[PDB]
UniProtKB/Swiss-Prot annotation, chain A:
A motif (ITIM motif 1) lies at residues 2-7. It is found in: Membrane. Phosphorylated on tyrosine residues upon stimulation with pervanadate and concanavalin-A (ConA). Phosphorylation at Tyr-4 and Tyr-26 is required for interaction with PTPN11/SHP-2. Dephosphorylated by PTPN11/SHP-2 (in vitro). Widely expressed with highest levels in heart, placenta, kidney and pancreas. Isoform 3 is relatively abundant in hematopoietic tissues and fetal liver. Isoform 1 and isoform 3 are expressed in CD14- PB monocytes and pre-B cell progenitors. Isoform 3 appears to be the major isoform in CD34- promyelocytic and promonocytic cells. During differentiation in monocytic cells, the expression level of isoform 3 decreases and that of isoform 1 increases. Isoform 1 is prominent in stromal cells and, to a lesser extent, in umbilical vein endothelial cells and erythroid progenitors. Cell surface receptor, which is involved in signal transduction processes. Recruits PTPN11/SHP-2 to the cell membrane and is a putative substrate of PTPN11/SHP-2. Is a major receptor for concanavalin-A (ConA) and is involved in cellular signaling induced by ConA, which probably includes Src family tyrosine-protein kinases. Isoform 3 seems to have a dominant negative role; it blocks tyrosine phosphorylation of MPZL1 induced by ConA. Isoform 1, but not isoform 2 and isoform 3, may be involved in regulation of integrin-mediated cell motility. The chain holds residues 238 to 268 of 269 of the full protein. Belongs to the myelin P0 protein family. This is Myelin protein zero-like protein 1. The modification Phosphoserine is found at S23. Coiled coil: none annotated.
Curated annotation (Swiss-Prot), chain B:
Changing F68K: In acute myeloid leukemia; requires 2 nucleotide substitutions. Interacts with phosphorylated LIME1 and BCAR3. Interacts with SHB and INPP5D/SHIP1. Interacts with MILR1 (tyrosine-phosphorylated). Interacts with FLT1 (tyrosine-phosphorylated), FLT3 (tyrosine-phosphorylated), FLT4 (tyrosine-phosphorylated), KIT and GRB2. Interacts with PDGFRA (tyrosine phosphorylated). Interacts (via SH2 domain) with TEK/TIE2 (tyrosine phosphorylated). Interacts with PTPNS1 and CD84. Interacts with phosphorylated SIT1 and MPZL1. Interacts with FCRL4, FCRL6 and ANKHD1. Interacts with KIR2DL1; the interaction is enhanced by ARRB2. Interacts with GAB2. Widely expressed, with highest levels in heart, brain, and skeletal muscle. This is Tyrosine-protein phosphatase non-receptor type 11. Belongs to the protein-tyrosine phosphatase family. Non-receptor class 2 subfamily. Phosphorylated upon activation of the receptor-type kinase FLT3. Phosphorylated upon activation of the receptor-type kinase PDGFRA. Phosphorylated by activated PDGFRB. It is found in: Cytoplasm; Nucleus. The modification Phosphotyrosine is found at Y59, Y63. It is linked to LEOPARD syndrome 1: A disorder characterized by lentigines, electrocardiographic conduction abnormalities, ocular hypertelorism, pulmonic stenosis, abnormalities of genitalia, retardation of growth, and sensorineural deafness. Noonan syndrome 1: A form of Noonan syndrome, a disease characterized by short stature, facial dysmorphic features such as hypertelorism, a downward eyeslant and low-set posteriorly rotated ears, and a high incidence of congenital heart defects and hypertrophic cardiomyopathy. Other features can include a short neck with webbing or redundancy of skin, deafness, motor delay, variable intellectual deficits, multiple skeletal defects, cryptorchidism, and bleeding diathesis. Residues 3-99, 109-202 form the SH2 domain. The SH2 domains repress phosphatase activity. Binding of these domains to phosphotyrosine-containing proteins relieves this auto-inhibition, possibly by inducing a conformational change in the enzyme. Acts downstream of various receptor and cytoplasmic protein tyrosine kinases to participate in the signal transduction from the cell surface to the nucleus. Positively regulates MAPK signal transduction pathway. Dephosphorylates GAB1, ARHGAP35 and EGFR. Dephosphorylates ROCK2 at 'Tyr-722' resulting in stimulation of its RhoA binding activity. Dephosphorylates CDC73. Dephosphorylates SOX9 on tyrosine residues, leading to inactivate SOX9 and promote ossification. Dephosphorylates tyrosine-phosphorylated NEDD9/CAS-L.
């Protein structure tokens, strides 16, 4: 079936934080 | 943009990339092998490669590498940073050309990929009381959002599952347009009490 790549994440440098952007809040709706 | 295809497996992704795509075309889609995960499917050298996207609930990554709060941020990063997607023999995987998925509606109140903050800016600058738009959810790939100006901007998640659309588990609709029309005639109201009238669309440009 569907086969997936084995990535190489070694080499260079990567951050350890979660890259995030400013987000909005989603309202609650009355039923 | 428009690289996210909600309703497809890797086999269908391969069909789309080999028929409509070129080398460098790519898309994202849900994972079938691990429900909850996502996948990139990328055309390279006349064949398709699939890349697993881990979704921990706090971030997305490629089982390693940089971590991202949203799927769109992961995709954007790997489009913009050449050489960071590589296999063990050194072969680079390049995300060059989004293979576009058709929009769920043709109406001009649908803004496609538009962040929540971008939508708030749009509604505060160009909108009036009761102005509204619909956009893709960034935090829930495959879902949508009704953003309404009332001054504040309110965002209402629209769940999309099995080609049906609903708000908060309420009445379900066969299309985005049907849902919007309904809630124009029957304005929803927040729990805090604010009535979200859909008075006029804020149209794309």
């Amino acid at each position: 079936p569907v086969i997936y790549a084995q990535l190489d994440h070694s080499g260079g440098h990567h951050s350890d934080k979660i890259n995030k952007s400013e987000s909005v809040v989603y309202a609650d709706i009355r039923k | 943009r428009r690289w996210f295809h909600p309703n497809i497996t890797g086999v269908e992704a391969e069909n789309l990339l080999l028929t409509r795509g070129v080398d460098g075309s790519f898309l994202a889609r849900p994972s079938k092998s691990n429900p909850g995960d996502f996948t990139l499917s990328v055309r390279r050298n006349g064949a398709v490669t699939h890349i697993k996207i881990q979704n921990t609930g706090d971030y997305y990554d490629l089982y390693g590498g940089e971590k991202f709060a949203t799927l769109a941020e992961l995709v954007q990063y790997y489009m913009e940073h050449h050489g960071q997607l590589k296999e063990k023999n050194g072969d680079v995987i390049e995300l060059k050309y989004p293979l576009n998925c058709a929009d769920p509606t043709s109406e001009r109140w649908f803004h496609g990929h538009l962040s929540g903050k971008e939508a708030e800016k749009l509604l505060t600058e160009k909108g009036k009381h009761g102005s509204f738009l619909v956009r893709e959810s960034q935090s829930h790939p495959g879902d949508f959002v009704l953003s309404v100006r009332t001054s504040k901007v309110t965002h209402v998640m629209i769940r999309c599952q099995e080609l049906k659309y609903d708000v908060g588990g309420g009445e379900r609709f066969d299309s985005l347009t049907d849902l919007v029309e309904h809630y124009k005639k029957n304005p929803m109201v927040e729990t805090l009490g604010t009535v979200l009238q859909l008075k006029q669309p804020l149209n794309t440009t």
